[PDB]
Write a protein that binds this ligand. Structure first.
Ligand SMILES: Cc1cc2nc3c(=O)[nH]c(=O)nc-3n(C[C@H](O)[C@H](O)[C@H](O)COP(=O)(O)OP(=O)(O)OC[C@H]3O[C@@H](n4cnc5c(N)ncnc54)[C@H](O)[C@@H]3O)c2cc1C
Ligand SMILES: NC(=O)c1ccc[n+]([C@@H]2O[C@H](COP(=O)([O-])OP(=O)(O)OC[C@H]3O[C@@H](n4cnc5c(N)ncnc54)[C@H](OP(=O)(O)O)[C@@H]3O)[C@@H](O)[C@H]2O)c1
Ligand SMILES: N[C@@H](CC(=O)O)C(=O)O
Ligand SMILES: N[C@@H](CC(=O)O)C(=O)O
Ligand SMILES: O=C(O)CC[N+](=O)[O-]
Length: 600
């Protein structure tokens, strides 16, 4: 009887299984039975990231109304549209549409979507689940696939295998190994990169000096786990938050290279489905870029794409600032950086001090010097208060946060420009991966406003200190020494060093046994763009056949999501409703390819 396997039962594997069930009546012949084997060491639907047994202190970064695992009539795919509830609709008044759910609540939605998919399965499809890791994949003698699980079971005779493996562990860097050894010699705690939900922070004591190395979304999780996760609470008075200490908190120090907590997301005013529709990086502009990459002269990100992104953002900022119907048609007719930009702005009442400045938004401390810790702290509090107040105006009427939310909305169009070798390799390396991607995350993949208002109260209470720009950490007898070379008096000896970031996708350093096996035996390879090696596993165009060391696309193997980062840009994002989600149309295309390779 026919069999297939899905490796990974997080959102992407669950979505493949829902799309398999949707198309199986059209693409399997009458009377044919298909067994789908679903393999995850975590209960299926939520997988490891969204498991319901995690701490309720940890939040999503997406509003509840924009979280779904179901296709909708906007989605351009070949399988049938099967409407279901968003997290907000399913949650039955437990959460507001513009509020941020707990990660455990998304888990409970995902466990229910999985149980519902088994209830709605057509009679041609039997699902079998396996609480296990897959550790080897091989060709059988007839060309069907063998999948070996770490519980000693082997699945044989498979017509197809889908790898939906998401956020995988990585072997520690040389720096992470030196710091782990230093912790062993001096009885310290070193916590390497990980989902904050997976780390044991109960080993940190009250009053202990702790460095969070990182100021991004992992930082905001550890900030919550070491405060409200230890009996801390907040109270609001005259608009303004105050932190109420439990006495169990450590002394929290934090820093990074840029030295700033990530920007607050503007409060959502676009509803469940609202997206900035591009007027500079248009589908017409994107088609022309894809035509040049196709004919072998790929665009340069900095020369050719960045000026369109910059114009897109600046136009939205100025349009929200000027609020006159005639302004934007006149501004959009001007080329990016033309001298008439400045003169048109002056004519609509915009002074030189309200003008966009990419250098200031990137490093807003760089005009000034800091004489001691105290001057850094007062500057930083002023900066975070202004950030929270811009975010309260929302992502439609607030000019700054409307403009930075363009960067979140444009990801669809940037993916179509840069994915599948749409850039030259040297531009991919030096412009996208080393400059745009980290700036973009700082500006547009930051926390809810509430997290910036909490951090500000923690800074006022002295429970958190941010050390300052260009964080330096050195190993000493009995501690690490952390300082900012831009903030005199910032030096502090800590006894816990937390690397507050996730492992990035890296096939070359993977700690997954299955991909290490495929890499050693020449059955997968790193995606390469003109001599630049990315961290991504190489796949064909949709429906994403796995490509072997010699460049051969496998007919029975497909890989989908985070492990393809390099082929694809910003894979670490769920489906949104009403916007022709590529995550949903990719799941549908992968499911239909699996059913066609089985259904011969
Ligand atoms: C901490 C964190 C917070 C996030 N917050 C948000 C957010 O707020 N909003 C948002 O849109 N996105 C968020 N994301 C992005 C995330 O990438 C997606 O939401 C989504 O989880 C990706 O789904 P996936 O199935 O590709 O990967 P994952 O959710 O990582 O699921 C992969 C699954 O595959 C399993 N697996 C891997 N290897 C094997 C193997 N060899 N055998 C068997 N099973 C295997 C794992 O156990 C895991 O269950 C977040 C990610 C993380 C890590
Ligand atoms: N709340 C949530 O839902 C949540 C929680 C956690 C994770 N996530 C998901 O996971 C993704 C990654 O989160 P993240 O916190 O890893 O990344 P992130 O949000 O981009 O923050 C990474 C931080 O680490 C610093 N940094 C990065 N690489 C470093 C390195 N090699 N050495 C030292 N410092 C380094 C960066 O600051 P500099 O930039 O100056 O170095 C930055 O402060 C998010 O984008 C999101 O998709 C979401
Ligand atoms: N339209 C086909 C595949 C394709 O040719 O794109 C499908 O039915 O899935
Ligand atoms: N995944 C996209 C939206 C979509 O599903 O196309 C995002 O980055 O938020
Ligand atoms: O420069 C920016 O990014 C914002 C414009 N401003 O003057 O606030």
């Amino acid at each position: 009887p026919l069999s297939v396997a899905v490796v990974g039962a997080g959102p992407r594997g669950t979505s493949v299984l829902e799309r398999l069930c949707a198309s199986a009546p059209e693409l399997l012949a009458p009377g044919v039975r298909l067994t789908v084997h679903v393999v995850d060491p975590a209960p299926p639907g939520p997988g490891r990231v969204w498991r319901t047994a995690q701490s309720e202190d940890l939040l999503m970064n997406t509003v509840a109304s924009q979280v779904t695992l179901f296709t909708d009539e906007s989605v351009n795919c070949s399988g049938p549209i099967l409407a279901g509830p968003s997290l907000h609709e399913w949650a039955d008044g437990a959460i507001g549409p513009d509020d941020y759910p707990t990660r455990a609540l998304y888990g409970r939605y995902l466990e229910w979507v999985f149980a519902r998919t088994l209830r709605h399965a057509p009679p041609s499809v039997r699902v079998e689940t396996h609480r296990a890791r897959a550790v080897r994949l091989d060709d059988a003698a007839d060309g069907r696939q063998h999948l070996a699980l770490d519980n000693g079971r082997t699945l044989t005779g498979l017509s197809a295998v889908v790898l939906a493996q998401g956020h995988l562990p990585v072997r520690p860097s040389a720096a992470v190994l030196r710091d782990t050894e230093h912790a062993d010699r001096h009885a310290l705690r070193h916590i390497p990169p990980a989902n904050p939900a997976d780390v044991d922070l109960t080993v940190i004591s009250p009053g202990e000096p702790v460095l969070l190395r990182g100021l991004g979304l992992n930082f905001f999780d550890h900030m919550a786990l070491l405060t409200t996760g230890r009996g801390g609470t907040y109270v609001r008075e005259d608009g303004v938050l105050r932190y109420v200490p439990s006495g169990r908190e450590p002394r929290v120090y934090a820093g990074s290279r840029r030295g700033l907590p990530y920007q607050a997301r503007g409060d959502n005013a676009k509803g469940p489905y609202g997206r900035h529709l591009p007027e500079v990086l248009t589908p017409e502009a994107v088609s022309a870029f894809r035509k040049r990459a196709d004919s072998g002269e790929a665009p340069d990100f900095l020369r050719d794409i960045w000026p369109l992104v910059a114009k897109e953002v600046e136009t939205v900022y100025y349009t929200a600032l000027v609020r006159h119907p005639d302004f934007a048609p006149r501004y959009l007719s001007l080329p990016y950086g033309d001298p008439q930009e400045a003169e048109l702005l002056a004519e609509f009442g915009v002074d030189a001090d309200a003008r966009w400045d990419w250098e200031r938004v990137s490093r807003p401390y760089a005009q000034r010097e800091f004489a001691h810790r105290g001057e850094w702290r007062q500057w930083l509090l002023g900066y975070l208060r202004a950030d929270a107040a811009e975010a309260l105006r929302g992502n439609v009427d607030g000019p700054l946060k409307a403009a930075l939310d363009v960067l979140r909305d444009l990801r669809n169009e940037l993916r179509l420009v840069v994915d599948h070798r749409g850039l030259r390799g040297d531009s991919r390396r030096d412009h996208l991966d080393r400059w745009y991607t980290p700036l973009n995350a700082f500006l547009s993949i930051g926390p809810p406003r509430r997290r910036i208002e909490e951090l500000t109260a923690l800074l006022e209470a002295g429970v958190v200190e941010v050390l300052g720009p260009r964080l330096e950490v050195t190993r000493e007898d009995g501690a690490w020494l952390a300082r900012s070379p831009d903030v005199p008096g910032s030096a502090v000896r800590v006894t816990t060093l937390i690397e507050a970031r996730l492992p990035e996708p890296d096939l070359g350093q993977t700690a997954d046994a299955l991909l290490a096996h495929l890499r050693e035996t020449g059955q997968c390879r790193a995606h390469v763009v003109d001599g630049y090696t990315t961290g991504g596993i190489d796949v064909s165009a949709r429906p994403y056949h796995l490509v072997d060391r010699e460049g051969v696309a496998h007919p029975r193997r497909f890989a989908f999501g985070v492990p393809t980062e390099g082929v694809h840009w910003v894979t670490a994002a769920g489906a949104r409703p009403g916007v022709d989600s590529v995550t949903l149309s990719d799941a549908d295309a992968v499911a239909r390819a699996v059913l066609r390779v089985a259904g011969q």
